[PDB]
Amino acid sequence: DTYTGFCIIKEGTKISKSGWEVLSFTTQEASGEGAGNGLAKCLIDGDTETFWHAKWQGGSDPLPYDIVIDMKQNIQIAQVELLPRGRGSNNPIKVVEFAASEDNVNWTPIGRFGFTNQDAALEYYVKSIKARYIRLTIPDDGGNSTVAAIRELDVKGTIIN
Ligand SMILES: [Zn+2]
């Protein structure tokens, strides 16, 4: 049975999010923002201008919020990157959490990190693992808010298949 230990890790290059597909999410804004924007799928679309925003117009969802992404490939995750909405926006996310999985059923948490609404992208040194599914979650215990928006999520690593 496996365990959590030390490791050297190169600084893996990014992955093509072309094949990808979010297969579930707690919440998204299907109108409020743009009419092609705010969606969960914006998180992984390669478009800077698109962002996911939690539902806010006409109702909102209680925290926590998560988004599970199917990476079509088995990948050795090394970093995770989040492009925040930034540009002075009210985006009071304070804590995000990442988990990951080879099959959609058993998850291992790969880190809990502080969030900052900087324009520049957020490099997160997750716990490296072999995984096909990452789950971005926004916990109900960070001092997080029902306002949460993210332009892009990327995964730096190497193809292990
Ligand atoms: Zn986007």
Q: What method was applied to determine this entry? A: X-ray
Q: Walk me through the domains of the chain, giving residue ranges and CATH numbers.
A: 1-161 (2.60.120.260)
Region of 104 (left: φ > 0; alpha: ψ -120 to 50; beta: rest) is alpha
Q: Residue 39 pairs with which residues in a beta bridge?
A: none
CA of 133 to the centre of ligand 1 (A): 19
CA of 85 to the centre of ligand 1 (A): 10
CA of 40 to the centre of ligand 1 (A): 9
102 has binding-site annotation: no
Q: What tokens appear for 152 in the block?
A: 């892009």
User: CA 132, 135, 141 angle in degrees (round to 5)?
Assistant: 155
Report resolution in angstroms.
Answer: 3.0
Q: Which residue has the tokens 């799928």?
A: 41
Q: Answer yes or no: are the C-beta atoms of 148 and 138 closer than 8 Å.
A: yes
Region of 86 (left: φ > 0; alpha: ψ -120 to 50; beta: rest) is left
- CA dihedral (109, 110, 111, 117) in degrees, to 10, reads -110
User: What is the distance between the alpha carbons of residues 4 and 70, in angstroms, rounded to a whole number?
Assistant: 23
Instruction: Give the H or E element holding residue 136.
Output: strand 129-138
Of 86, 96, 84, 100, the residue nearest 157 (C-alpha): 100
Residues with CB under 5 A from ligand 1 (ion): 42, 45, 47, 50, 151-152
DSSP 19: S
Q: Answer yes or no: are the C-beta atoms of 100 and 157 closer than 8 Å.
A: no
